[PDB]
Amino acid sequence: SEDVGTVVGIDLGTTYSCVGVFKNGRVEIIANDQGNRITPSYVAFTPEGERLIGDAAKNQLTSNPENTVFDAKRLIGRTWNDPSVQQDIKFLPFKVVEKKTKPYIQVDIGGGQTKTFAPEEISAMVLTKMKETAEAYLGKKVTHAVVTVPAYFNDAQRQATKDAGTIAGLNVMRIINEPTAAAIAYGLDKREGEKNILVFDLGGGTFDVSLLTIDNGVFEVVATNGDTHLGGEDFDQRVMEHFIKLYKKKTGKDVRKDNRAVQKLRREVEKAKRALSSQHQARIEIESFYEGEDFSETLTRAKFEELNMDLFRSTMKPVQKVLEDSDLKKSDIDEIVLVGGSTRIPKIQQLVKEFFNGKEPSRGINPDEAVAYGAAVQAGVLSGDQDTGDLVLLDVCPLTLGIETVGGVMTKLIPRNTVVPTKKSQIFSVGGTVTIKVYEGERPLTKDNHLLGTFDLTGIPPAPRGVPQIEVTFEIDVNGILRVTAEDKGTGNKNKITITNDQNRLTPEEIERMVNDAEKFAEEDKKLKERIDTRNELESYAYSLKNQIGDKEKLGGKLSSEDKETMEKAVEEKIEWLESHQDADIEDFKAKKKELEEIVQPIISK
Amino acid sequence: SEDVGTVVGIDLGTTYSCVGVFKNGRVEIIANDQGNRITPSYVAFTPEGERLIGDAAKNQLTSNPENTVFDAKRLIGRTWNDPSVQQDIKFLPFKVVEKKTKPYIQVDIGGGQTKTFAPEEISAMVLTKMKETAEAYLGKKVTHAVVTVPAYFNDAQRQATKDAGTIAGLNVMRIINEPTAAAIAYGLDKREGEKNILVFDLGGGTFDVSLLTIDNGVFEVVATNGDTHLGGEDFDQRVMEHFIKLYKKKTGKDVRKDNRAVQKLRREVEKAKRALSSQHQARIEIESFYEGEDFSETLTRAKFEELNMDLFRSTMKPVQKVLEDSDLKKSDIDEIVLVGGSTRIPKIQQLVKEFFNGKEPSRGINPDEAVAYGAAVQAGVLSGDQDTGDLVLLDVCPLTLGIETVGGVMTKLIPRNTVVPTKKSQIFSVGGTVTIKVYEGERPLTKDNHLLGTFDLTGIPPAPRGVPQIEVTFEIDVNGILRVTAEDKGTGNKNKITITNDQNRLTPEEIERMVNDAEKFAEEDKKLKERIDTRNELESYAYSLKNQIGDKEKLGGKLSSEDKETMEKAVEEKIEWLESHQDADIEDFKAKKKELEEIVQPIISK
Ligand SMILES: Nc1ncnc2c1ncn2[C@@H]1O[C@H](COP(=O)(O)OP(=O)(O)OP(=O)(O)O)[C@@H](O)[C@H]1O
Ligand SMILES: Nc1ncnc2c1ncn2[C@@H]1O[C@H](COP(=O)(O)OP(=O)(O)OP(=O)(O)O)[C@@H](O)[C@H]1O
């Protein structure tokens, strides 16, 4: 069977991502090359064409706002005409343009070239950085992964996330819903009897609530609901609007035409928001904010709350929906599990606590890392060779699926909160071409909901005297993704044929072109890391020699006058060279190291 | 048997204190009347003579620095000539004076009176505030408690902490060492097999390390070591000294003479220190800092680390000591548990991780609350009627005890890290009067260590022809406190008489006077809470009526013109009165409420 190697769990988040592995009976949340256990979901292309991902990309955002990309999770799997897309792109500094029917991110990638990237490709870059982080930690290549999605992601958003994994060179063995992952983190070693757990997940871009039953490693989602365009970024944007208006009232200046100013303001607003989770006021100060003038304003917690109060209060509606859908009352909830960084907000914690009549949330749960933690546990299970303890997951589809047959019935097919995998079939006996539209959502008229896709039954061949009997099967798989197949029942013949969605999902050929593109940049990453590693080696070697020569009681005391002169000359020459050749290639660093060695050795070996 | 009621667990900390209870199978960490689950270990007396404790005391520190008291845990149980006391009092703004050979805190308590308080009385006020917090949450009186102490507290510091509990009206059922409490928090529900746990506890004033073995609710400390004058406050003081020097060089001004300036600087330094645990830079700004001039400086994380590098590095020595005393090597440690707020410092976490060759600390442990959590669990066990699961604790004495008998031998008695309770006896056959000094510490000459106390055997019978046989017993009890008793073996008699320590600890009579004093203030607290509660009732009633009268589609629409006028008038009159009588007594609020009611009822009942 396939060697899946070490399987990693990746929480692919709107603003931050996080990767973990299950090793030696425990989860390791893996720190990146800057020592951070979470990584900004940012990518950028420098003026010289270098691809940056993560902390480096975020760090140069204000200097390069149009070619820095973030919040791609708010675009992934969506179409151009999605009202959410059209609202969000107004506030993103990078260009987003329509290609056929989808939002593509357009940036300058160097060499005078402009490139348009599918959101899948941007998210694949983030996944690649998480993969690189894991590989660095493990000292070996990673090929397989469990990747998270919001529970309320629709079919296309799920498929697009899986495609991002493929483009990053990952076999995505499982797409896991974020609250379900957090539930595993909470409950893996719990031995407290069967309990109802409410997971309240409010991150940087999305909001999910799921109600689970948990009993000794058996986890079942009973109901889920959410909002895929509600999270910390929206709270930031409410504050930014406030201060842009305030600044215009105070100075007469509208700074929105200035990307650099707006992004400096965004950076400080984010820091202020975080401060306000433990302070009651925060000062926002920006030196030479706009046209030379300084910015200095105070944001009180009360104002932050006021600016966001409708958004904060709206998180209670999905809680009420999952309680109703689970046939439970408030008091039936045994534990409340808060995850996602925005659950650090005091007004959020208060709203949830008050909703549940004073019941306090479960403790010891890191809201930034719990999702990655659970993903890592499921990855450990799928690895096969781990001591995870037993783990059984039963999850559900978030949206009612219904179909509209042109010239046929329109009907509900699979209700929301149905345990997956699940399937439903429909017989078509009409003959000729059959066209079926699939919709997702809870409005009573099926076609008033979100269009998932259009599926055509082309080849129903004759059936002399007999009745046409085409069975179409709609199956939602364990990843929450729909596959439509058809088989002729009248023929008896066995071949189920997959019907492709007319709505233009990435094809395997398109995906492979994106993979090849990604692999070019990955090769650059590899060579850069090797180059920097050998530069670091030369640097440490030279400075070490410098210290030894200066030690009068060891080597510096053993060296003759003459040899000591020669040694110092050689080492200081190499250090000078280093200071002026930081950008040299691997070969040059190696060669300078060996020159220095061939000078030093006949001397120290005396 | 005694009804111990609901037993609370109180972490009595240098800078913050925290109280928990075990109810319904879980620990509740109890929020105070300001919603905070930790409370500043601060007390103050307002110019009008009101005693403030906790958040209110800390809030007015800069306006009243000489009559605000904090860091009493660095004085409790110590003598005047203790080098630690003499060093610390130089940086405390309140007066500390010598009496009973001890440091007493001298403050103005109002009415033109100056009072000197034992450190035990100050800590008793903090314990009283924690008690009040618990009673508010529980809706009933609390009489019994488990109170924490640093593992490395000596005999007198332990006894003084217990006495503080008594003065606060608490029967302290157990004194529990802070790392042992943290270990219970970590391991209560763990089912991972026998493991060695290293608890590294760095709080606001003290540092403890303990190595434990844990196996399914059996917790045994193998070795412990620490520093009772090393913690967050010291790091703050290093930064303080830095900026006072910097300000003097910059302006020529020495602000040390100005208590208000110094305490503003301290407040902002504490804020900055906390910021630097997640940022690399922090801005310290104080408006009208000194003689009208503003303060504005930046503290980098690198500078904070440099200012404290010797202190940070010194925490590794106790780790090495407990590893050696446990006969273990670094790799034998299965879990590292960090507790105490100062373990949030990145350089600290780095030093610990590097010491243990990359081993990461256990996750999901709140460093501010874990000690109170464990104390709450042990309190739950002592309550008797809780479902805590089984819990067995074996703890040790931190210091070697030895004795010096005047005219007799000097000898080690009880080695450090001996499991307690434990006892050791010595026979004296000399007759006359026997004087025994008891010393604590590890220096090879017993009397070079810390003097615990002096004990005299007065009544030794000279029995006819037979030789005197007085057995003196030195017992360390389960609280870690020494009791010295004597019995006559030659007599035969079984009556063991307790020998009182000449180094006079508080006597029961002195303690009861302190209790009576505390109880007067507690009565003031009670009356204030009642008064404020009824003022709040009148307020809410009046404003409620205001809202109802303005509701045109219910009461406002029901009321006649006339009656509405009378209603509005009555309510507005009462609100005016409230706005000018915030300081009215209880019966006045009651009377105004009753008057308003008597006006409103004949009208709304139409
Ligand atoms: N102390 C804090 N106070 C308020 N908000 C915070 C705090 N810390 C982090 N956040 C917010 O949390 C968000 C990031 O949370 P996290 O990374 O857990 O979610 P995510 O995985 O990015 O989002 P999603 O799951 O929605 O894709 C950011 O919006 C950030 O501003
Ligand atoms: N983020 C942070 N970075 C640095 N220090 C912090 C941080 N948060 C809290 N501290 C420090 O932690 C200390 C308080 O810790 P905590 O209350 O757990 O200990 P304590 O019980 O007061 O002290 P002790 O046990 O020594 O008597 C204070 O010195 C505080 O400044």
Numbering used by the authors:
A (entry chain A), B (entry chain B): 24 to 629
List passages from the publication reporting this PDB structure.
As the most abundant molecular chaperones across all kingdoms of life, Hsp70s are the key players in every aspect of cellular protein homeostasis, including protein folding, assembly, transportation across membranes, degradation, and quality control.
Unlike all previously reported Hsp70-ATP structures, this new BiP-ATP structure, BiP-ATP2, has an entirely wild-type (WT) NBD. It does not carry the ATPase-deficient T229A mutation (T199A in DnaK), which has helped maintain the ATP-bound state in all previously reported Hsp70-ATP structures. In the BiP-ATP2 structure, due to the packing of L1,2 against β4, the distance between V429 and T462 is quite close (4.4 Å for cβ). Astonishingly, the fluorescence intensity was reduced almost threefold after adding ATP, whereas addition of ADP has little influence. This strong quenching induced by ATP not only provides support for the presence of the fully closed conformation of L1,2 in solution, but also suggests that this conformation is the major conformation for the ATP-bound state.
